[PDB]
């Protein structure tokens, strides 16, 4: 598992 | 369309 951060504007493990 | 930024460890319009 991982931390995972996204940019899409917005901004958030698994 | 729009920018979209991922960090998962890796970091990269659609």
Aim: aromatic share 24%.
């Amino acid at each position: 598992a991982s931390v995972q951060i996204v940019y899409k504007a917005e901004f958030x493990y698994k």
